């Protein structure tokens, strides 16, 4: 079974349904862009992101960065972007772990918390896009996830979203539509020895990161943020296990350490883990309380009873006779654990059977240009490490020296750090 039922071509004619010109709810004006609905609640916009941040509206030019204002400007590039992103969703979905994450993402509808009257339930407009219909008029469509190209810095990938004036949607349990800046057209080099990979002065990047991992990393953030359980970026770990990090004063957010998982997540101590678990449990209780107060729905597209069921399913709430919702602590702890401990970069690596950075606490080595679209280069099932070839063994497909036709090095980062 496939996650993406249509193998879209960029030049396929608009239909106003799953191939359409759209606008996103950014502050300020934008012209519509052509977008593709690859799955319920998930769209792909094959454009550079000059839209989500007002201060990031152009594509001109930090050690680890890469600029090219012309990338993703042509139709062929946008066709290959769509096929590349589609192939990576399929690679993710082909694993049991990735099917679980993607199900959680689709179920993670952003909360209808836009009403200021507590007897009324209402959508928040920034968790929608506006879609041009065949008659030229717009309709509003709710969605959970948008994959978009990077902004000026091509290799700055990130899972971001529109705020609310008052509510912290990624941290209050509500969730918000997530926009992931991502490219399948580049990847990163890392070193197979830990002591080299974590040293800013050594290594040229012999192995290449499988872009499925990189996309999964951003999807794990999107899961946190859709469930409104992201850890505030101002909660950070003062790294004290890397002499180079300490000289630079480099701190790493708890949200990143969680997302990576493995040993990195254990830098968050038990007291703090318990603190966050209680904090978000209290948010889920607030959501149950809010749903119980709501006696009407705003709008005509969905019934109150349907939307109450959507959020019962999202938050795994208990519903008694009255139809009253409560949060069961065991079910909360289970879902919270799933989202935060089961869906991790380290666990994806195990499912994909790839070589990868061993820690988030490293130094990048290089950026490579790649093309994952041709099945002779990369597959859903095997990534670069093609079965029944010289590339199947020992991660030889990720070995940029052995599989050199698959990688062109664009830039070295070793030595550029101030060390």
């Amino acid at each position: 079974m496939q996650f993406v039922n249509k193998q879209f071509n960029y030049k396929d004619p608009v239909n106003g349904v799953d191939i359409a010109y759209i606008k996103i709810p950014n502050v300020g004006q934008m012209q519509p862009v052509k977008a593709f609905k690859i799955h319920n609640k998930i769209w792909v916009i094959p454009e550079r992101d000059t839209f989500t941040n007002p201060e990031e509206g152009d594509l001109n030019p930090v050690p680890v960065s890469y600029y090219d204002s012309t990338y993703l400007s042509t139709d062929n590039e946008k066709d290959n972007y769509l096929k590349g992103v589609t192939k990576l969703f399929e690679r993710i979905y082909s694993t049991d772990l990735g099917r679980m994450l993607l199900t959680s993402i689709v179920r993670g509808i952003p909360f209808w918390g836009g009403s200021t009257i507590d007897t009324e339930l209402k959508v928040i407009d920034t968790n929608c896009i506006n879609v041009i219909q065949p008659d030229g008029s717009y309709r509003s469509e709710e969605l959970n996830l948008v994959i978009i190209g990077p902004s000026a810095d091509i290799i700055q990938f990130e899972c971001k979203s529109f705020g609310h004036e008052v509510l912290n949607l990624t941290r209050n349990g509500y969730g918000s539509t997530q926009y992931i800046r991502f490219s399948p057209d580049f990847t990163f080099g890392f070193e197979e020895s830990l002591e080299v990979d974590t040293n800013p002065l050594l290594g040229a990047g012999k192995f290449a990161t499988d872009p499925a991992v990189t996309l999964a990393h951003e999807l794990i953030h999107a899961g946190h943020r859709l469930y409104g359980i992201a850890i505030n970026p101002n909660r950070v770990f003062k790294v004290n296990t890397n002499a180079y990090y300490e000289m630079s004063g480099l701190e790493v957010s708890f949200e990143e350490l969680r997302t990576f998982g493995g040993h990195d997540a254990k830098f968050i101590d038990s007291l703090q883990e318990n603190e966050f678990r209680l904090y978000y449990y209290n948010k889920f209780k607030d959501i149950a309380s809010t749903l119980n107060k709501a006696k009407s729905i705003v709008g005509t597209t969905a019934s109150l009873q349907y939307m109450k069921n959507v959020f019962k399913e999202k938050y795994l709430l208990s519903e008694d006779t009255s139809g009253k919702f409560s949060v069961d602590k065991l079910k909360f702890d289970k879902l919270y654990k799933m989202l935060t401990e089961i869906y991790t970069e380290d666990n994806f690596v195990k499912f994909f059977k790839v070589l990868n950075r061993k820690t988030y606490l490293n130094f990048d080595k290089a950026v490579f240009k790649i093309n994952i679209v041709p099945k002779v280069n990369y597959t859903i099932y095997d990534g670069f490490n093609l079965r029944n070839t010289n590339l199947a063994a020992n991660f030889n497909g990720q070995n940029t020296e052995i599989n050199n036709m698959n990688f062109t090095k664009l830039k070295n980062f070793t030595g550029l750090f101030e060390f």
Binding site: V64, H221, Y245, L250, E251, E256, Y360, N362, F363
Partner: peptide, 7 residues
């Protein structure tokens, strides 16, 4: 996504 973004 990388830690050195914060430098």
């Amino acid at each position: 996504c990388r830690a050195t973004k914060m430098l």
